[PDB]
Amino acid sequence: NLYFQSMSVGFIGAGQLAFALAKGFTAAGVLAAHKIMASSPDMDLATVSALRKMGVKLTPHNKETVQHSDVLFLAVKPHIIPFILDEIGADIEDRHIVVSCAAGVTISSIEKKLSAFRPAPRVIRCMTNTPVVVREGATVYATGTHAQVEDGRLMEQLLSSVGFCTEVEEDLIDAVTGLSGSGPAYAFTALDALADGGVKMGLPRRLAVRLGAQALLGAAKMLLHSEQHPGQLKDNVSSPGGATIHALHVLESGGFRSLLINAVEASCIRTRELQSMAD
Amino acid sequence: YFQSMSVGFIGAGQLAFALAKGFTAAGVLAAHKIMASSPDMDLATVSALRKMGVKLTPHNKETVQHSDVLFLAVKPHIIPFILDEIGADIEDRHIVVSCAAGVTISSIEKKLSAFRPAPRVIRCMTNTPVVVREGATVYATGTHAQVEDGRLMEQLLSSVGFCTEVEEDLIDAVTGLSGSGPAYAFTALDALADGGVKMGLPRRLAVRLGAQALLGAAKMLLHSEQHPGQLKDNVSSPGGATIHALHVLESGGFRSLLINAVEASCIRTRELQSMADQ
Amino acid sequence: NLYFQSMSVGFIGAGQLAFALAKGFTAAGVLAAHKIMASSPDMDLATVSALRKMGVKLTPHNKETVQHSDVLFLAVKPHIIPFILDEIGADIEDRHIVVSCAAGVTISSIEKKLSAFRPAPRVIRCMTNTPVVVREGATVYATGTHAQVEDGRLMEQLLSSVGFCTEVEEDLIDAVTGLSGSGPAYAFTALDALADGGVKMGLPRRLAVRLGAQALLGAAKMLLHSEQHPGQLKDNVSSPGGATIHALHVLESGGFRSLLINAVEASCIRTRELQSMAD
Amino acid sequence: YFQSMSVGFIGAGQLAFALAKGFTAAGVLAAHKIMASSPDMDLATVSALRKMGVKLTPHNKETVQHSDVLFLAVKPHIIPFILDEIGADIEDRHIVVSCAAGVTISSIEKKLSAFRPAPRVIRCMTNTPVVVREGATVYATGTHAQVEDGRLMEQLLSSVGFCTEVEEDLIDAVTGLSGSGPAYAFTALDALADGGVKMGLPRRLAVRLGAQALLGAAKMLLHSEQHPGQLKDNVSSPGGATIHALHVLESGGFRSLLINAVEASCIRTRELQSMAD
Ligand SMILES: NC(=O)C1=CN([C@@H]2O[C@H](COP(=O)(O)OP(=O)(O)OC[C@H]3O[C@@H](n4cnc5c(N)ncnc54)[C@H](OP(=O)(O)O)[C@@H]3O)[C@@H](O)[C@H]2O)C=CC1
Ligand SMILES: NC(=O)C1=CN([C@@H]2O[C@H](COP(=O)(O)OP(=O)(O)OC[C@H]3O[C@@H](n4cnc5c(N)ncnc54)[C@H](OP(=O)(O)O)[C@@H]3O)[C@@H](O)[C@H]2O)C=CC1
Ligand SMILES: NC(=O)C1=CN([C@@H]2O[C@H](COP(=O)(O)OP(=O)(O)OC[C@H]3O[C@@H](n4cnc5c(N)ncnc54)[C@H](OP(=O)(O)O)[C@@H]3O)[C@@H](O)[C@H]2O)C=CC1
Ligand SMILES: NC(=O)C1=CN([C@@H]2O[C@H](COP(=O)(O)OP(=O)(O)OC[C@H]3O[C@@H](n4cnc5c(N)ncnc54)[C@H](OP(=O)(O)O)[C@@H]3O)[C@@H](O)[C@H]2O)C=CC1
Ligand SMILES: O=C(O)[C@@H]1CCCO1
Ligand SMILES: O=C(O)[C@@H]1CCCO1
Ligand SMILES: O=C(O)[C@@H]1CCCO1
Numbered sequence A, C: 001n002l003y004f005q006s007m008s009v010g011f012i013g014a015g016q017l018a019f020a021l022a023k024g025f026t027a028a029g030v031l032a033a034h035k036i037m038a039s040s041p042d043m044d045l046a047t048v049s050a051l052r053k054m055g056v057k058l059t060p061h062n063k064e065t066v067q068h069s070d071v072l073f074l075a076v077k078p079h080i081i082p083f084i085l086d087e088i089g090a091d092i093e094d095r096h097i098v099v100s101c102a103a104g105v106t107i108s109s110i111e112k113k114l115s116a117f118r119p120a121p122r123v124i125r126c127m128t129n130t131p132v133v134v135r136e137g138a139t140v141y142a143t144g145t146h147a148q149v150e151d152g153r154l155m156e157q158l159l160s161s162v163g164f165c166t167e168v169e170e171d172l173i174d175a176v177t178g179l180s181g182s183g184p185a186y187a188f189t190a191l192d193a194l195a196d197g198g199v200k201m202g203l204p205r206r207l208a209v210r211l212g213a214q215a216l217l218g219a220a221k222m223l224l225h226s227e228q229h230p231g232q233l234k235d236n237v238s239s240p241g242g243a244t245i246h247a248l249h250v251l252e253s254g255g256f257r258s259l260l261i262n263a264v265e266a267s268c269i270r271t272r273e274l275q276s277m278a279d
Numbered sequence B: 001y002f003q004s005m006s007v008g009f010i011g012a013g014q015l016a017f018a019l020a021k022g023f024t025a026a027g028v029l030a031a032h033k034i035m036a037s038s039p040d041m042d043l044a045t046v047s048a049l050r051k052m053g054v055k056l057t058p059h060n061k062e063t064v065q066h067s068d069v070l071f072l073a074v075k076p077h078i079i080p081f082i083l084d085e086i087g088a089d090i091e092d093r094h095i096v097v098s099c100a101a102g103v104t105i106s107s108i109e110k111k112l113s114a115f116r117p118a119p120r121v122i123r124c125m126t127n128t129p130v131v132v133r134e135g136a137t138v139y140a141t142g143t144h145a146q147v148e149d150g151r152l153m154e155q156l157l158s159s160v161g162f163c164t165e166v167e168e169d170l171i172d173a174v175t176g177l178s179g180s181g182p183a184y185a186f187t188a189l190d191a192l193a194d195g196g197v198k199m200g201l202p203r204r205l206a207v208r209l210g211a212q213a214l215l216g217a218a219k220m221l222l223h224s225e226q227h228p229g230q231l232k233d234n235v236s237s238p239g240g241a242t243i244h245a246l247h248v249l250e251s252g253g254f255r256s257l258l259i260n261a262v263e264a265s266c267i268r269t270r271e272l273q274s275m276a277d278q
Numbered sequence D: 001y002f003q004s005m006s007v008g009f010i011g012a013g014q015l016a017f018a019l020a021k022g023f024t025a026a027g028v029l030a031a032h033k034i035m036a037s038s039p040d041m042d043l044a045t046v047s048a049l050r051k052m053g054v055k056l057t058p059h060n061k062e063t064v065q066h067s068d069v070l071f072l073a074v075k076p077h078i079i080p081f082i083l084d085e086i087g088a089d090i091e092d093r094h095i096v097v098s099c100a101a102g103v104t105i106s107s108i109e110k111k112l113s114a115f116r117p118a119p120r121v122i123r124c125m126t127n128t129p130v131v132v133r134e135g136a137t138v139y140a141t142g143t144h145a146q147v148e149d150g151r152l153m154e155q156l157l158s159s160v161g162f163c164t165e166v167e168e169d170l171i172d173a174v175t176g177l178s179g180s181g182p183a184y185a186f187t188a189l190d191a192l193a194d195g196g197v198k199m200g201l202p203r204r205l206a207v208r209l210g211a212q213a214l215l216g217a218a219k220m221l222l223h224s225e226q227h228p229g230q231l232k233d234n235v236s237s238p239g240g241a242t243i244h245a246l247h248v249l250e251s252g253g254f255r256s257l258l259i260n261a262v263e264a265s266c267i268r269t270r271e272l273q274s275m276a277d
């Protein structure tokens, strides 16, 4: 177990991801809010104000975030990453671990930029998701060419405080993006629709929202704690001739399964395009 | 808080195991204060209840005599036969909690009232995630259930997940939403994992990531004051990977399928309510 | 607020957009009709005659419009824009603000043409829509390379008199075109169909058109004045088991949402396509 | 013009709140002339209505005693219970205005006439945009409504939107069109915003632009003597962006989905009543 409670963390970008991670870390108690600095050009944004009330240091100056930070998260859109690297590359020091969270952007492209200024930049690529805000994120990371022995362990310890975290080979991360990165939006869509179905059949909206969300949470937790296949868990719900198997039929008749496959594929493929676009 | 109270299950299958495991993990009931009965003493769910410390028997009358709260955890078409069997054994102290999909309070009271008047009946709809103490449960109180009977039930079932009282005429819809709900999620998680596998993830990792993503999103919604659509908006950046995937969901009518599912399960439950009452 | 009550405005092109803007500006009382001039090569057109009855000055000669104008709107079709710039480029003076309304046409292409004649053309690109004719348009604009300090402020002040107006980065305007530029046609199609539905269920056509249009106007205004997500207002107004949620289901079963996404995307892509051909 | 008139709401939900707020914003009633009652009123609604100047009570009989015009703004299956509760308290002066989907004048008059003959009953269908004074309202007059009662109703509801008299047999169809209409619009605006976001717009800007486009287009049609198809033709330049988007709407049967929606809501409305009768 590595000690990191005293280190300073910075976010280039002060948007949804910066807020979600900063909220998760502080709510986990593993970092003090004043250890965190975030920067963006527009300092009148809603996420910036949300970060403000949390106690995070805010500035328009990306260089200040770099000078403040030990671990530096890149939390801008993919096409902005190369501009950021040109802007702050000269301010990267030997102490810095650069953790890119941008969809699609390769370690190789980041190291190429930063190596123009200083050899051996310590780079880690991450994909996470917004439920880090409730400490139930799904995070993977890959270590770059010059990442020190314990840089990967440090990032795993830090990110494990706000959800599941595991090291992966970098060539998996675009597919992770399509599954758990975009995944919450799939779930919010599903929850909205399930609530609509509950309302159609006579439930108050607030109850339908609560029951749907609790059903999804409980089922997901069951699967995480089970050694059983999701199909077996499915079999355990449905009684012969019963209500559940009738509902499963109408899902199958609409190709429900194929739509979720389509979604993971579409997000992964778009992620690969966001890299060739920023390239 | 629930010291001295005895609980019994008529039926020893998926739901009886789930509830018994959840109650005992919650510490609200000692396993030996729980008795379950089913005809086949060799079944797998009875094997695990035994290892859990739950008293087991093949005779439904033993469960009735042991219990204060009596859970009916048999299939809907088996309830009328159970009530015929144990009807003469219902005492004044008993609270009979039917878990069966579609079986109406009216049908249970009519059966039991032939043996002794004022049976205290509660109908509930729960789901299998009570086994990890994250269930979703509603209940409706019967004609002769005392107000404190509904309160006791809510406190007991709140130990294993969300629990709230509803009017009985909403239980069919709840069945279609949170009762069948886990099966929709297991289907979705299997398909999401297939999608991860297609794009190059190992199956075990894809399952873990998809399930963690669903759990985290559901917790976000429960801990948020905000609309699911608002949370959808907040997490879909312009031109990004997520909004591209949302479009292909929309093009297949994803939302309508989940509406169809809740409706289909509810309507089938109503057909079961009509069988119970006819 | 800038004093511009006395300035002169010109339209190259005397068609649907020139009429809608001139009608909105004069109805707002911010420009006098005799301070507006519009040109097109055919002087017996219906929009020309409509502009005529409004008191706008009309001419076949684009050079006359340029010489008349302080603010010069380009309201010709996208493929006509480069010919106009070649025609009038030598007549552009220091006083001129050139406001292109053409779908897809980039500030860069306009400045490149005009710069061959005189350096530092003051260029603004906008996207608007025909409801400026009832002073409820939706307008965005981006400022060009040589736009002076108050050129953007002037154009926002002018266009705010006929609807919503805000500055954007130019790279958003093709998307805006697919949303609020083409938006009114989506609405007219929807209103025709809703009225057909009213008629099928027994309403006189005139009443069905009136009710459908009032419903759409009121709902849009409700959303604009609420601090609410449209899904929340959908949720709030629906009732369990009720008529609305049954109708929402049949919309969903048809993939209604996906069609509107398809439309915005198709209009935006077509807008981008035409400009790639122009380049 | 309604110097002394008092208005009551039985119910305090989405519709009662929207009408009370629209009437308040219109300034058509004197101060403290609105009362609303419900049995378990959400505290956020209590707070909002109280700050607005609206009187509140859990007792429906008190609303009746307060009111000259009494709006019934409860769910359709709740209407007959309300009529049984308040029927003995209806007075000569009262105009009872049912807002409930599906519920016929006939059924209301039969309930009320058991207590006192000649209840003055009006049935309306409106929509939540009355809250911004842009509602769409129709009404039908009952058997004993005096002719001036329908005139008063029209003048009152005209202060918060369009309002016109119809035969009662049109109201279920109106419900499917302008009653449910706003929900169709909110769905469309959410989808249009998703489309703007997909093509690169910030969500907040996409929502603002889509809503403004819808508002402006609707106002154009209301202020035009032309067919919506003709207004469509004026945007659709040959080979242009708009006609390309219209094609993909047509390829998905966009128009038929909206016809399906109006039909489905109207048919369900007829079931919200054929079940009650
Ligand atoms: N949100 C999610 O669900 C997840 C997102 N990600 C990744 O995180 C990154 C950001 O996503 P998200 O936070 O959602 O996007 P946001 O739009 O919410 O945040 C973007 C931030 O970048 C800021 N920014 C823009 N230009 C600069 C600049 N030159 N220097 C510094 N900051 C700048 C913006 O400020 P302004 O608005 O003022 O330009 C805004 O604060 C993306 O690459 C995405 O792939 C990864 C996992 C999950
Ligand atoms: N599983 C779920 O997801 C949920 C199910 N429910 C309801 O719970 C009830 C049971 O569900 P589930 O547990 O899944 O079904 P199972 O089939 O898994 O368990 C059924 C049990 O009933 C027993 N049984 C059959 N006949 C008798 C009898 N005459 N006397 C005593 N026990 C008997 C069976 O024993 P044997 O195997 O020996 O026949 C078995 O132990 C159903 O009514 C269902 O609607 C409600 C919410 C969630
Ligand atoms: N209509 C809309 O909904 C919106 C349109 N726009 C943009 O506005 C521009 C015009 O659109 P719209 O007004 O609809 O198209 P119209 O066809 O209605 O008007 C086009 C005008 O250009 C005139 N014209 C053709 N050649 C010349 C020329 N060489 N010199 C001067 N005028 C000429 C035409 O005259 P003749 O008929 O004699 O050729 C006609 O008066 C387009 O670029 C479009 O993208 C932007 C937002 C909304
Ligand atoms: N929502 C809409 O878009 C439109 C709805 N309508 C019609 O308006 C009526 C109400 O709809 P809506 O306002 O949406 O429904 P809501 O559910 O939002 O409001 C229902 C109201 O009825 C109240 N209520 C329930 N029982 C009683 C009672 N015994 N005495 C008094 N009040 C009671 C509820 O009380 P509590 O506050 O205690 O829960 C709540 O205030 C319906 O008939 C609907 O058809 C018509 C046009 C538009
Ligand atoms: O299909 C069934 O019978 C049960 C009821 C609710 C969960 O699945
Ligand atoms: O939509 C996107 O591009 C990012 C990546 C996954 C979460 O949201
Ligand atoms: O959904 C319903 O039943 C009501 C009537 C129309 C507006 O919402």
Ligand SMILES: O=C(O)[C@@H]1CCCO1
Pocket: C103, C177, C181, C182, D235, D236, D237, D240, D241, D242, D243
């Ligand atoms: O269809 C077109 O190309 C024009 C321009 C954008 C609005 O409608």
